[PDB]
Design a protein around this ligand. Structure first.
Ligand SMILES: Nc1ncnc2c1ncn2[C@@H]1O[C@H](COP(=O)(O)OP(=O)(O)O)[C@@H](O)[C@H]1O
Ligand SMILES: Nc1ncnc2c1ncn2[C@@H]1O[C@H](COP(=O)(O)OP(=O)(O)O)[C@@H](O)[C@H]1O
Ligand SMILES: Nc1ncnc2c1ncn2[C@@H]1O[C@H](COP(=O)(O)OP(=O)(O)O)[C@@H](O)[C@H]1O
Ligand SMILES: [Mg+2]
Ligand SMILES: [Mg+2]
Ligand SMILES: [Mg+2]
Lengths: 191, 548, 546, 520
């Protein structure tokens, strides 16, 4: 049953063209128009793409209004970062935000100093990662010992975005699914 | 493609029924199924054989080195293996000797048949091959026989008979175990020399009573018998000579009650006064006729009343309980009494003769002894077998049954007709049967050849169990039978056999001076029933089972 | 053993508590339970075993190094013997099966000394004085390996390591192979100290003819496939240049976090061209250097393959880091991580290229291997093992890998001693006379230490399915006269052991079996240090996981 | 306190060897009837659902998952025999089973050690290769008439013996095409292509030296019949290649966006103009092709075919001699293929097929097999792999031996004469090797329906006279010499069989304990 679904489900618009000579045109082009429409929706939703270094008055808008988005429940995820330059984990998490911002343009990446965020915040609890969605806090994450701590990598951060429902599991942009071209080249030769 | 049709027209029979044809190597599997329990028999043949623990579902354990006994408790699934169980069961019932051999041969004939069926020999020719080998095998056993007993009772001749039999089951020490049997065999036999009467012997005459404690050296041979009974009234050493008399009654020592509604009836006080004293005077009057005959011990067959017991121990008459039929019949054969169920006077001709009845402590419990003397001998003697472990008592007791079963082999045929043991009788048939294959033409010669190869298991087993390398001990023994033109005419190369302990090389210093031999009657039916075990398994080409 | 003890009676521990001689007995059964699988694998008469992973996959193994590593044991006392088998494989590389049996019997034989109210501190002291007395006796009885004018001090050494394997019958053919292999891959370091890097030779898992017809390569064999099929497979002629590169040769993006931005669209195609051109400029200068064969750690894109196919260059992708160092070391080249120099310019010099006589690609049963032979600067070697399947060759791979470690030690240290349990039986006669001299309670410790050493020659006879006491009694008789030899050679009744194929006691020097003395030294200390670790434990405290 | 998560219990002693040897016998029983010319066929139900109808040993064993680990050593022998030669796979399994079956009653009965048996098999293997070298002889390799009967030997077991006259010419022309001069025969099966076309008739076939593509032209104006085609291989896509740097363009002026799409057209225009610098007529590319690039190639008549596999491009290169070049700037007249002809696209309703034909000695071809079903196409395709597999060894080495049980009987007769002459402890297992070679002749006889007890009895006396070429016929079961009929095989098949059979027995005989539960 899955062998028929893998022709369309496991191929993007660039990979669907492989089956142009083999499979029927009406079977293939019917799905390419569907996948083409999904690509256009992501382009319209790409309202972001760099870290929004904000300040508090604005928090009451950027962090929360955005989380409502269109309010068609067009919700928008907003990853906040209570930065603290003295901590080593904070500078690591700041690099992950800019790296993920260039890839996931639909998700908003927010950064602010922790001293300016909350009155007399504990410095030991920093860096803090909050995830808003439709005005509600989906995840109040603590320091990155859960995500490896000092040895945190980009692969661990992208895996966390899938757990909170920010990115799909089978997304082609994730490093877990985005296999290298040399990897797929060896598979075709050994097939 | 995803699923087969799963054997259509299978609803002809039930789902639990299964067929097993000769194809698909299933006859090889049946030979392999025999090979599972056959290797258990390899460690259990010979004097160095090892016993086996068999824990039943009830928990009753029996330790044993015999096959017919061990196969009774094991529940078997394969029907071809059950042929060996009933084949060895037939061996134990008829002759009581040579069961490991049945299994060992009927298993190796199926082993060498694994090579014959794989070569392409038809099953019909295989049965014809072993049958023609069987007729030549039984013929040559009568030809190469040497020695005979020629005397029913002798001290030295019985050592040649019993000792090689019990040497397999619980070898231990030779003299202390052999003397207990040879002494007991002489007691029960009706010797009667120079009369022309037919001899007679019963397997049920010699019986062993198990008593815990002591050691094997303290075992004695009792002339009479023994039970674990307690006298009711009083105990008596009976130091009075001038022998007592014996009266056996099968009915209980009590008033013979009416079988149909025995109930009192007293119409007036005159019968009430006399009914209590009438039972006392009636029971006393019956004891007067019994007591005047000079009897001092009565063996009862069932429960004895208290009023009858009060008048028996008045005159010092001993009471013995035997609440069963066979326990009462075995005692009459000792004293030679004829029981009568009536409560009257025993006849003087029917009264038995027993000199003394002692009560001593052997196993801590009360036992009653009936030792006779040299005068007025008796039969159905017992053997007091002392030991520490109850499991060892069971296997030694069945060794006496095998030894007593070997004594039965002298009565029916014309004589003893002993053969050389220690593999000499098996290795000699290999050369004779091999020469027989060369004389006969046809495709059956390979069946005759493999029949000789199957007989190598007896010397190969005794060499393996003895802790020796069979590759060097076996071909060293073939040199005694490969030889020719050697000096002596009166040739003594037939007594060469394997050796369990001792000199290197192994051809034994004859089985002679050693005084170990085998019986002809055991080898005849053993090869007959072993060939029938291989015949019925090889002749069948399809097997059908149910529920498993 | 009998029943479980009370669980924290007025102690208040979350886990289990046990004490007394019960846990000491459990450690003995624990060391004996893991040692029973090692018993049947000892000596040439031992048989192999197979471990199933519950997925169909299985592997045949004789040595207890990887067997105990695969057997996941949860009892921590058994883990020390598991790590002891892995420890002995790293340093010595042989005798992993013997330390487990020796360490288990030292604990088993010392278990009787525990219930005699001999303290473990006194027992190990009696073992340790027996140890250093045994090491000095081993240092007296051993022998140097130049030994004789003929070699065969290396042909005979291989037979001991090659015994108890599937290819022990073919050890006569493989004995010449291993000695010719390690003498080719020698090196120089520390101003005159010769070294022999183990695993430097390439063990290929080939299938085909047989283990007897395994051809020894006079050079290194690279196990990798060709990139394109239209390339030349065979390159003849002398002085074949070898280029060893590691930089990234496929087309890659810009720096790790930069973004390309341009206003004028006219130069948008030009920046695309130079990114495609800058990678081909590196390939242009290699062709100017004239490298016939080039090897790369990373991939090779199709933009580079067209230049190698045109100029008849052998480009091979998917090389590994540890291999190319041995290619450059053998062929005489140097490892090139990037093309640059102290000056600002970028170029490639001909001195970076190696030299070899012949390079041929061969295929055998779906195994493409590039045969590089005739290295001018330094020689190399590789062994193409051939058998039934890959899992049978894993035993042969471990058999060869252990053989290199044994032949490594006899050249690093010329002193050797005979096999067959000779030194194990000789120490018993030496320690019995020493046990009486010391007097007090250590006599039983030294005596039972000597009795435990006899388990090595006893296991050779038990696994042989022969009578063991006759061979041990005859070996005891000859060694008993060695201490009472009465010197004046006529110092006979020494250097004898068991011959299992015939079942006689003969001279091991003429039979052709030896072992280096350093393996006996490290095995005894590592076996006793493991015995010290188990004997000193009194009570266990197992905490359940939260 | 288990001490072992992986089989704390053990099955040691002799019972493990009974399970090993009996399992080695069971794998041979399911393919005992798969030998000789009257051999039967088998069917396998894979879990994916793709059925296959097979009689070759390698296809039977590889598609059967076995739970017994000791048996799996026997399953891999046909895999080893397949990749090495590709013929004679069934004989290795039954021969290894008979060696293990014959060597079974020696540890049970004689209690002889396994390592003594290991020495016995090596000396028997040394003598087995010696007498096979004596029985073998050379023949002429260049005689095409002689090569037909040798290819017909392995074909006689399979279904296509009825078309043996066509199959020999089909395989002999194919193996000679890929053959070249330089182990003196370095050609490989990977160059030989075999395309399976359902439908047609197996009698109508031919060996076309080319590469059969399974797709249509991309534009309808292109001519499907070219007299003098010119092949040019390419790896670059004709589409616009997207840069991996993720370049973003800041458009401020209005003419920038129009100029970008004009530069896109100008790049494809300049790229197509460089293709026409060498004026080709047939272009091949392994990647996509944009519709913009199709129009500019119409003026030159450059027929383009897209999404071609990487292996097919190499096969196109060896036939036409074209060089694979990625960039479009480095096209020269030498890069353009030559000596090609007969480019024609035959119309078939299922799929479009394009032929190629020739007028750097490496060559390739494509065998177009016609049949009645896809499953029997795999049968005839595997027979082609067996048809060329028997032909490689006669070309590699000129050595050659008889077959049909005669060469195996010659090993048993020679070993039996010296078995009594040895007179040692190893002679008992040495006799088992001589008895182990009797299964093959026996198997052949049994399948044929004859009585093996008397046919093999006179065969012993026949070989005792001093001849070796006397075998057993598979149809009627005579003792006629194989020189008349012509049953001959290479020497490499029998050499690999006795070597793999002995080496597999040494692996399995030295096992005494079985364990599981590791979960690596
Ligand atoms: N001490 C001994 N020396 C040599 N052979 C013996 C010795 N004891 C027994 N045997 C042989 O071993 C064989 C074992 O016979 P077996 O079948 O065990 O008798 P049973 O039927 O009583 O079990 C005998 O036939 C005998 O020849
Ligand atoms: N041919 C032989 N004769 C006698 N003893 C041998 C022989 N080969 C090996 N041994 C003994 O076997 C012991 C261990 O052998 P080893 O090669 O370490 O086995 P493994 O390779 O399984 O670790 C050595 O101490 C040695 O005395
Ligand atoms: N008509 C025949 N007459 C005699 N022998 C034959 C005949 N056909 C096949 N054989 C024998 O059977 C063998 C079958 O070989 P093949 O089918 O190629 O592989 P496998 O031996 O694995 O089945 C050949 O080696 C050949 O000697
Ligand atoms: Mg008996
Ligand atoms: Mg070793
Ligand atoms: Mg074939």
């Amino acid at each position: 049953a899955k062998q028929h679904e893998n022709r369309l489900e496991d191929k993007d618009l660039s990979d669907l063209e492989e089956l142009e000579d083999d499979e029927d045109e009406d079977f293939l082009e019917a799905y390419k128009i569907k996948r083409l429409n999904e690509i256009r929706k992501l382009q319209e939703r790409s309202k972001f793409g760099e870290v929004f270094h904000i300040n508090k008055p604005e928090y009451n808008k950027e962090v929360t209004l955005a989380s409502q988005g269109k309010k068609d429940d067009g919700g928008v995820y907003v990853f906040v970062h209570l930065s603290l330059q003295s901590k080593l984990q904070s500078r690591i998490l700041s690099h992950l935000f800019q790296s993920a911002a260039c890839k996931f343009r639909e998700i908003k990446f927010v950064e602010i100093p922790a001293n300016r965020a909350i009155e007399n915040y504990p410095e030991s609890n920093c860096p803090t990662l909050i995830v808003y969605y439709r005005g509600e806090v989906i995840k109040n994450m603590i320091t990155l010992l859960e995500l490896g701590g000092n040895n945190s990598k980009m692969e661990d951060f992208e895996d966390f975005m899938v757990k909170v429902g920010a990115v799909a599991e089978g997304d082609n942009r994730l490093i877990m699914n985005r296999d290298d071209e040399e990897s797929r080249e060896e598979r075709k030769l050994h097939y | 493609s995803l699923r087969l049709p799963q054997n259509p027209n299978a609803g002809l029979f039930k789902q639990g029924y299964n067929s097993y044809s000769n194809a698909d190597g299933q006859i090889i599997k049946s030979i392999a199924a025999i090979r599972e329990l056959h290797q258990m028999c390899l460690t259990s043949m010979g004097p160095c054989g090892r016993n086996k623990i068999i824990v039943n579902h009830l928990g009753k354990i029996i330790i044993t080195n015999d096959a017919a006994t061990m196969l009774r408790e094991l529940d078997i699934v394969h029907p071809a293996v059950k042929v060996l169980v009933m084949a060895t069961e037939q061996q134990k019932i008829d002759m009581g000797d040579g069961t490991n051999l049945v299994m060992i041969l009927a298993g190796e004939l199926l082993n060498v048949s694994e090579k014959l069926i794989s070569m392409g020999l038809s099953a019909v020719e295989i049965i014809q091959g072993y049958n023609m080998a069987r007729k030549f095998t039984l013929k040559e056993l009568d030809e190469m026989v040497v020695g005979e007993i020629t005397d029913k009772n002798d001290k030295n001749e019985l050592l040649k008979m019993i000792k090689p039999v019990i040497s397999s089951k619980k070898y231990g020490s030779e003299d202390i175990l052999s003397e207990l049997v040879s002494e007991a065999v002489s007691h029960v036999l009706p010797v009667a020399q120079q009369a022309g009467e037919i001899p007679y012997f019963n397997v049920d005459s010699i019986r062993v009573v198990k008593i815990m404690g002591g050691s094997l050296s303290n075992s004695t041979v009792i002339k009479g018998m023994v039970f674990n009974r307690e006298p009711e009234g009083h105990v008596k050493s009976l130091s009075e000579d001038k022998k007592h008399k014996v009266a056996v009654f099968t009915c209980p020592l009590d008033i013979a009650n009416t079988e149909t509604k025995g109930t009192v009836l007293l119409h007036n006080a005159q019968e009430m006064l006399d009914f209590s004293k009438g039972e006392e005077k009636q029971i006393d009057a019956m004891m007067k006729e019994i007591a005047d005959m000079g009897v001092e011990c009565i063996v009862a067959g069932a429960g004895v009343g208290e009023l009858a017991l009060h008048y028996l121990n008045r005159y010092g008459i001993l009471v013995l309980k035997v609440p069963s039929k066979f326990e009462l019949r075995r005692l009459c054969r000792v004293c030679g009494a004829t029981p009568l169920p009536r409560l009257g006077a025993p006849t003087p001709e029917e009264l038995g003769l027993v000199e003394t009845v002692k009560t001593m402590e052997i196993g801590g419990d009360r036992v009653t002894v009936f030792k006779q003397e040299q005068g007025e001998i008796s039969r159905t003697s017992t053997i007091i077998l002392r030991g520490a472990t109850q499991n060892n008592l069971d296997d030694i007791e069945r060794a006496i049954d095998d030894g007593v079963a070997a004594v039965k082999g002298l009565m029916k045929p014309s004589g003893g007709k002993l053969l050389p043991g220690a593999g000499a009788t098996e290795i000699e048939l290999i050369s004779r049967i091999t020469k027989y294959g060369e004389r006969t033409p046809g495709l059956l010669q390979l069946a005759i050849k493999q029949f000789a190869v199957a007989f190598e298991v007896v010397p190969r087993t005794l060499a393996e169990t003895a802790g020796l390398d069979v590759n060097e001990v076996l071909p060293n023994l073939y040199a005694a039978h490969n030889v020719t033109e050697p000096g002596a005419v009166k040739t003594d190369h037939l007594y060469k056999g394997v050796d369990i302990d001792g000199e290197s090389d192994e051809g034994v210093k004859d089985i002679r001076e050693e005084n170990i031999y085998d019986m002809l009657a055991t080898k005849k039916f053993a090869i007959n029933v072993a060939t029938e075990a291989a015949t019925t398994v090889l002749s069948i080409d399809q097997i059908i089972m149910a529920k498993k | 053993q009998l029943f479980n003890n009370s669980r924290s009676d007025t102690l208040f521990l979350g886990g289990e508590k046990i004490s007394g001689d019960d846990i000491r007995n459990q450690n003995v059964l624990a060391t004996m339970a893991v040692a029973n699988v090692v018993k049947s694998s000892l000596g040439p008469v031992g048989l192999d075993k197979m471990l199933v992973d519950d997925i169909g996959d299985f592997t045949v193994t004789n040595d207890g190094a990887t067997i105990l590593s695969l057997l996941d044991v949860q009892h921590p006392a058994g883990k020390i013997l598991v790590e002891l088998a892995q420890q002995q494989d790293r340093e010595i590389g042989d005798g992993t099966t013997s330390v487990v049996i020796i360490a288990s019997e030292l604990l088993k034989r010392a278990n009787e000394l525990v219930k005699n109210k001999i303290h473990p501190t006194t027992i190990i002291t009696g073992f340790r004085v027996a140890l250093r007395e045994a090491i000095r006796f081993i240092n007296e009885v051993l022998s140097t390996s130049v030994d004789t004018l003929g070699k065969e001090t290396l042909i005979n050494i291989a037979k001991t390591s090659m015994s108890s394997k599937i290819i022990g019958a073919d050890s006569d053919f493989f004995s010449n192979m291993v000695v010719d292999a390690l003498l080719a891959v020698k090196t120089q370091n520390s101003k005159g100290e010769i070294k022999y890097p183990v695993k430097a030779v390439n063990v290929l898992k080939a299938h085909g003819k047989s283990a007897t017809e395994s051809l020894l390569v006079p050079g290194y064999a690279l196990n990798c496939t060709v990139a394109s099929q239209a390339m030349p497979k065979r390159i003849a002629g002398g002085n074949v240049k070898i280029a060893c590169l590691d930089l990234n040769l496929q087309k890659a993006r810009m720096a790790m976090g930069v973004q390309i931005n341009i206003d004028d669209p006219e130069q948008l195609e030009q920046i695309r061209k130079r990114e495609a051109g800058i990678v081909l400029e590196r390939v242009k200068k290699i062709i100017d250097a004239g490298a016939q064969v080039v090897l790369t750690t990373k991939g090779i894109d199709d933009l580079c393959l067209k230049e190698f196919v045109e100029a008849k260059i052998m480009g091979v992708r998917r090389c590994k880091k540890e291999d190319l160092r041995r290619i450059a070391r053998a062929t005489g080249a140097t490892l090139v991580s990037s093309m640059s120099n102290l000056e600002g310019e970028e170029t490639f010099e001909s001195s970076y290229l190696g030299l070899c006589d012949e390079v041929v690609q061969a295929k055998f049963s779906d195994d493409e291997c590039i045969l590089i032979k005739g290295t001018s600067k330094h020689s190399s070697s590789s062994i193409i093992l051939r058998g039934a399947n890959d899992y049978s060759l894993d035993e042969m791979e471990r058999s060869l890998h252990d053989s290199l470690s044994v032949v490594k030690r006899t050249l690093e240290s010329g002193n050797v001693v005979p096999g067959g349990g000779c030194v194990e039986a000789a120490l018993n006669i030496y320690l019995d006379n020493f046990a009486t001299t010391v007097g007090s309670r250590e006599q039983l410790a030294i005596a039972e230490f000597a009795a435990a050493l006899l388990i090595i020659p006893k296991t050779l006879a038990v696994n042989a399915a022969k009578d063991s006491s006759e061979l041990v009694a005859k070996l005891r008789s000859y060694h008993a006269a060695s201490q009472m030899a009465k010197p004046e050679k006529r110092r006979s009744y020494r250097n004898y052991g068991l011959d299992l194929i015939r079942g006689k006691i003969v001279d091991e020097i003429h039979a052709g079996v030896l072992e280096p003395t350093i393996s006996k030294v490290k095995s005894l200390k590592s076996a006793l240090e493991a015995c010290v670790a188990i004997l000193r434990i009194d009570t266990m405290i197992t905490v359940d996981p939260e | 306190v288990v001490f072992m998560n992986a089989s704390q219990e053990r099955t040691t002693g002799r019972q493990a060897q009974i399970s090993n040897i009996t399992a080695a016998k069971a794998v041979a029983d399911v393919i005992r009837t798969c030998l000789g010319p009257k051999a039967m066929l088998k069917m396998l139900l894979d879990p994916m659902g793709g059925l296959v109808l097979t009689n070759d040993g390698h296809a039977i064993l590889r598609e059967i998952d076995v739970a017994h680990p000791a048996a799996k050593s026997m399953l891999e022998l046909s895999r080893t025999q397949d990749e090495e030669v590709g013929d004679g796979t069934t004989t290795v399994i039954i021969l290894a089973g008979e060696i293990l079956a014959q060597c079974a009653p020696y540890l049970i009965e004689k209690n002889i050690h396994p390592v003594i048996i290991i020495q016995a098999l090596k000396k028997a293997l040394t003598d087995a290769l010696e007498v096979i070298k004596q029985v073998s002889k050379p023949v002429d390799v260049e005689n095409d008439a002689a090569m037909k009967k040798l290819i017909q030997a392995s074909i006689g077991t399979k279904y296509v013996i009825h078309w043996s006259e066509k199959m020999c010419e089909l395989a002999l022309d194919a193996v000679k095409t890929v053959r070249k001069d330089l182990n003196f025969e370095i050609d490989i099966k990977r160059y030989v292509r075999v395309e399976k076309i359902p439908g047609g008739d197996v009698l109508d076939s031919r060996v076309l030296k080319g590469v059969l593509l399974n797709k249509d032209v991309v534009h309808p104006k292109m001519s499907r019949h070219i007299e003098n085609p010119r092949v040019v291989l390419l790896d670059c896509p004709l589409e616009y290649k997207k840069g991996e740097s993720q370049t973003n363009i800041e458009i401020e002026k209005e003419e920038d966006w129009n100029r970008i799409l004009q530069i896109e057209e100008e790049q494809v225009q300049l790229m197509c103009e460089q293709i026409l610098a060498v004026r080709p007529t047939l272009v091949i590319t392994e990647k996509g092709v944009s519709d913009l690039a199709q129009h500019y190639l119409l003026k030159g008549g450059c027929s383009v075919l897209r999404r071609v596999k990487k292996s097919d491009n190499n096969r196109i290169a060896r036939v036409t001699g074209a060089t694979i070049v990625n960039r479009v700037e480095d096209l020269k007249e030498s890069d353009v293929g030559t000596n090609c002809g007969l480019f024609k696209v035959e119309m078939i309703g299922d799929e479009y097929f394009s032929f190629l034909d020739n007028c750097g000695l490496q060559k390739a071809c494509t065998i177009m097999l016609r049949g009645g079903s896809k499953d029997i196409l795999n049968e005839i395709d595997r027979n082609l792999q067996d048809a060329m597999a028997v032909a490689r060894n006669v070309m590699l080495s000129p050595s050659l031996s008889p077959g049909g049980g005669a060469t195996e009987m010659a090993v048993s007769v020679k070993l039996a004469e010296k078995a009594k002459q040895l007179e040692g402890i190893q002679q008992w297992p040495y006799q088992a090797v001589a008895d182990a070679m009797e299964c093959i002749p026996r198997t052949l006889i049994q399948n044929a329906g004859g009585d093996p007890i008397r046919l093999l009895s006179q065969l012993r006396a026949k070989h005792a006279q001093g001849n070796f070429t006397t075998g057993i016929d598979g149809d009627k079961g005579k003792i006629v010499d194989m020189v008349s009929y012509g049953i001959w095989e290479p020497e490499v098949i029998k050499q690999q069989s006795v070597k793999t059979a002995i080496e597999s027995a040494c692996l399995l005989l030295r096992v005494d304990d079985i364990v599981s539960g590791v979960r690596k």
